[PDB]
Amino acid sequence: VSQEEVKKWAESLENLINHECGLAAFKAFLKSEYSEENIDFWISCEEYKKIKSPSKLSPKAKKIYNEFISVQATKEVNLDSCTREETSRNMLEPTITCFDEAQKKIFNLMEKDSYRRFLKSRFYLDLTN
């Protein structure tokens, strides 16, 4: 990784997720915090943000909701108790802003924790001496 690219990670989370090596380094970093569910959830949420038809959101919404938001999900995602409940009510009316609020929580959570840790992480320090 070049020293120019890691500095972008210090400028915004999107750059870390939009960087080919940031994703590689970020995916491995999540493994350290066992927060790999966050990136898998982010990939499903990204597809949700690209679908602009509220008719197809329902089918996949139940699968993502039952898979990632289900209290019985084998891989529950770290979210507030209100965010999950809000998504459940959106199932009655699937909109493009249905999972947008949840992704924002993942962005703020990893940003308030992963970014703080990334700057102090050995990987960032090694790449950023």
Side-chain angles (χ1 to χ4, degrees):
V1 184
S2 68
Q3 290 182 320
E4 290 177 0
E5 290 170 0
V6 296
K7 290 200 196 310
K8 290 180 180 261
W9 303 353
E11 291 178 0
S12 44
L13 180 62
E14 290 180 350
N15 289 59
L16 180 68
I17 301 184
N18 291 313
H19 192 272
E20 180 173 49
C21 200
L23 288 159
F26 183 65
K27 280 181 169 93
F29 179 78
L30 290 174
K31 228 184 221 67
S32 298
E33 290 178 318
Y34 302 97
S35 26
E36 65 193 353
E37 61 209 340
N38 290 335
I39 190 69
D40 290 339
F41 180 87
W42 180 80
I43 293 170
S44 63
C45 262
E46 288 257 310
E47 290 175 359
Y48 195 97
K49 284 185 164 69
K50 290 180 180 120
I51 294 165
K52 290 180 177 159
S53 294
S55 71
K56 290 188 205 297
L57 303 182
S58 262
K60 73 193 280 141
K62 286 180 175 82
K63 293 180 180 182
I64 288 161
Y65 180 97
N66 290 332
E67 188 177 350
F68 290 90
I69 302 301
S70 155
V71 294
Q72 292 178 355
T74 69
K75 45 180 180 191
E76 290 179 15
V77 283
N78 41 27
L79 288 173
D80 300 353
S81 300
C82 230
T83 303
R84 293 190 209 166
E85 290 180 350
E86 188 173 352
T87 312
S88 70
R89 292 191 272 167
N90 290 337
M91 309 299 262
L92 300 158
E93 299 204 59
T95 60
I96 191 67
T97 60
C98 170
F99 289 83
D100 292 353
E101 187 174 353
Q103 183 180 57
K104 180 180 170 140
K105 296 280 181 115
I106 300 302
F107 259 50
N108 280 255
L109 183 79
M110 63 214 286
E111 183 172 1
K112 291 180 182 330
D113 261 29
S114 80
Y115 250 50
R116 300 278 184 162
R117 304 254 190 165
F118 231 84
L119 297 172
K120 290 180 179 99
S121 60
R122 290 180 297 165
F123 290 92
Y124 183 90
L125 292 173
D126 290 340
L127 306 160
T128 72
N129 278 271

